[PDB]
């Protein structure tokens, strides 16, 4: 059993990427945000408060013949975003890219925060972190990936995110076609329930590589690259005019500036993020101030290799019984 689905950025900034997923019988197709930094499959639904849905596609569990209430069961989730969502829970048949999983927990939004309501292109999240992070009560549920694992040819998915362009998520196999050279695998710590790993250092542009251990999480569900304040200060030092803004809340740089690339280390290998990836465009419509893609982790508590770093690479999430993270160039 394998599965490939095309994943598509939601806007010209690549803020996020949506993937179509089939839920229910017959299928209702919703566009979900694949999130390797959470563990809940949650969807906008026929129970979602009507003043809280826009032009999202909703999941109607009463039109699925496979859909069943998980009685008493209940969820609540919160994001680094400050984003929130909650409700009750169904099991149903979920399909991604022709890979089918039956009796998947599909967590049906009753409530949803403003940030989600104003995002019309995202119909819900599909969490692909480790199941310990799942939020359903009183009985914790397993992720889609966990439910598929056993059925899979290999207990693996890959992420191949595009810069300004569609990409692919594969399940159960590695497209040797999709990257260049070698995959470099590196150890994953599961203890916090993240795809948590340890980078071996960094370079800015054509600069010397500094060997220093950077611990953080592979998170397809975060837009930006979040790195320690030291690292992030060295990057923007090389961009004339760049400054940390208290008003906008991060580093901004004049839009007419050239952005150096950013290299990070996985084992003895190196991934270069071209500087174009790091431009997130005018902080406001008309401004000549542009928002940077590398921002300080100091206020999160954790470093995040979000989409800015992952879309520079071909990324393997090896969900074996000792999990690993592979990076290749593409």
């Amino acid at each position: 059993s394998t599965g490939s689905a095309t994943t598509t950025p939601i806007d010209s900034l690549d803020d996020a990427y949506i993937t179509p997923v089939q839920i229910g019988t017959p299928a209702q197709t919703l566009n979900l945000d694949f999130d390797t930094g959470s563990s809940d499959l949650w969807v906008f639904s026929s129970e979602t408060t009507a003043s809280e849905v826009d032009g999202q596609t909703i999941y109607t569990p009463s039109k699925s013949t496979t859909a069943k209430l998980l009685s008493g069961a209940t969820w609540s989730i919160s994001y680094g975003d400050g984003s929130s969502s909650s409700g009750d829970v169904y099991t149903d048949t979920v399909s991604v890219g022709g890979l089918t999983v039956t009796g998947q927990a599909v967590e049906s939004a009753k409530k949803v925060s403003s940030s989600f309501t104003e995002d019309s292109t995202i119909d819900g999240l599909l969490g692909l972190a480790f199941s310990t992070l799942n939020t359903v009560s009183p009985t914790q549920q397993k992720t889609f990936f966990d439910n598929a694992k056993a059925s899979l040819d290999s207990p693996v998915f890959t992420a191949d995110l595009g810069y300004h362009a569609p990409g692919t998520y594969n399940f159960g196999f590695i497209d040797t076609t999709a990257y260049t050279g070698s995959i470099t695998y590196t150890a994953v710590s599961t203890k916090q329930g993240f795809w948590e790993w340890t980078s071996t250092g960094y370079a800015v542009g054509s600069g010397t590589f500094k060997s220093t251990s950077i611990d953080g999480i592979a998170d397809t569900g975060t837009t930006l690259l979040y790195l320690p304040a030291t690292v992030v200060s060295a990057y923007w030092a090389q961009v004339s005019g760049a400054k940390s803004s208290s008003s906008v809340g991060g580093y901004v740089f004049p839009c007419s500036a050239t952005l150096p690339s950013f290299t990070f280390g996985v084992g003895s290998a190196r991934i270069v993020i071209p500087g174009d990836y790091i431009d997130f465009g005018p902080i406001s419509t008309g401004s000549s101030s542009c928002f940077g893609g590398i921002q300080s982790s100091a206020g999160i508590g954790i470093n995040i290799f979000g989409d800015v770093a992952l879309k520079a690479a071909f990324v393997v999430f090896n969900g074996a019984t000792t999990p690993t993270l592979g990076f290749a160039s593409k």
Partner: peptide, 6 residues
């Protein structure tokens, strides 16, 4: 931007 369970 978005930042998915931190």
């Amino acid at each position: 931007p978005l930042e998915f369970r931190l």
